Amino acid sequence: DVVTEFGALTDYRKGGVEIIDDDPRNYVFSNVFEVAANAAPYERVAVGKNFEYVIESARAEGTSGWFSCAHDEFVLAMDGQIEVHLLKLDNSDAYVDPDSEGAVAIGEALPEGRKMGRIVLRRGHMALLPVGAAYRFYAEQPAAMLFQSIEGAVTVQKWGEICQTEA
């Protein structure tokens, strides 16, 4: 009977690079669950990067501070229930430079603006994080998530510690 295998923070099975004639560091190989497993709550660790564009892996745990961004972002839930809260900022320019890129951490205090909505994501669920909204997360238990964004102020880079270096 059909079993489709998904990973989880507590259950993943990392693969890797076998070398015929090459260097494994060319393939920048990591597992997003291992990365989120080893990170601080809500720490946004780059796991993919193509020029300025990044994919960040994070472990949601408890309530995050608020974030805003000068461009759209997307969040994909990879394992565990994660609640997203959206707020339409009165003056987004007061929190985020409309010329910066990448998420900005705008603090624990409720920014000024109107309640936009609430989203609850489970594994495999993707949400829009729209430009001009601030967003926060809540996760009762540790949950894995991924961001589609741009390298910026919240983006942690630690390629040497996350990727395969030997074969």
Partner: protein, 327 residues
Amino acid sequence: SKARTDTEHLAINNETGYRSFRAGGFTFTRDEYFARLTWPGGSHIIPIDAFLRAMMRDVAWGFFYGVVNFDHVFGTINHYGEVTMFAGRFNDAYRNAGRDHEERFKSSALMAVFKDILSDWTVEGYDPFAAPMETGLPWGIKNGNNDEAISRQRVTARRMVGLPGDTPVRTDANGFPVNRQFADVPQEQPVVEAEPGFEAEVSAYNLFGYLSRSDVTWNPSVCSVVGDSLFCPTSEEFILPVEHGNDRCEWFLQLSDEIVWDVKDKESGKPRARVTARAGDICCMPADIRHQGYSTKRSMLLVWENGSPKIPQMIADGTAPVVPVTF
């Protein structure tokens, strides 16, 4: 030094029942088992199933990014508006002997005859976009067509699946049931609660569900966009029908099950590496390799592209690195 537009419908063979085709100096003929290619000074044979599966992709993808190698000999290089078709360009034996041959075409001229070949050669009950266990066979003489299989409309999100006026979520009622190898994947929508007036900006959807309903294999399709960052996930089964030599780095994030990637040098075709990726593994394919994937069970893969037209030149100039991160 203009790009070519000379293509031609040649005769129907009265035995096999297939038409042959010409594009510049290349001609295309199939028989019961093979696609038979010719160019000035050379010939090549490709089993007709491998050939139609690779052709289905080049056509579906509008020539995609960089080099779509149908095999170790024959393929295309997209130049975005023009396209090179080749034999031996990325084969050291051909190149060292000076026996490679290339012809540059206007993209829509080459595309229109690729569509004609694809249509004429695809027989009733044969779906070159499906996995082998999902479909019939291409062998033998012409017998009807599968024009609907080879005519599927591309789906691309402008911003994200599910947004108003954007590409819709897949459901049984819109003709996208769950694939039998994804039968156990949960299909609930996430909870979305919009305050009045913000319903167009509070949005979320079941991505793994949408993928479990893909009707074709190995077909990256844009689900979400931030500038030139394109999330292109797809469901993979059997073998990726081409070896892709991208003109830029690209990232693979494995969402379900397992794929192994055969990694070859882009220029020579020599094996360099094999990459095994299981659920949550993310890795990059350098710009200087070509890759081909093997998925035993239909699997969910995210293909992550940077669609910036400026990258190929920068890589060619040596201004941008062939590996996107260094450490």
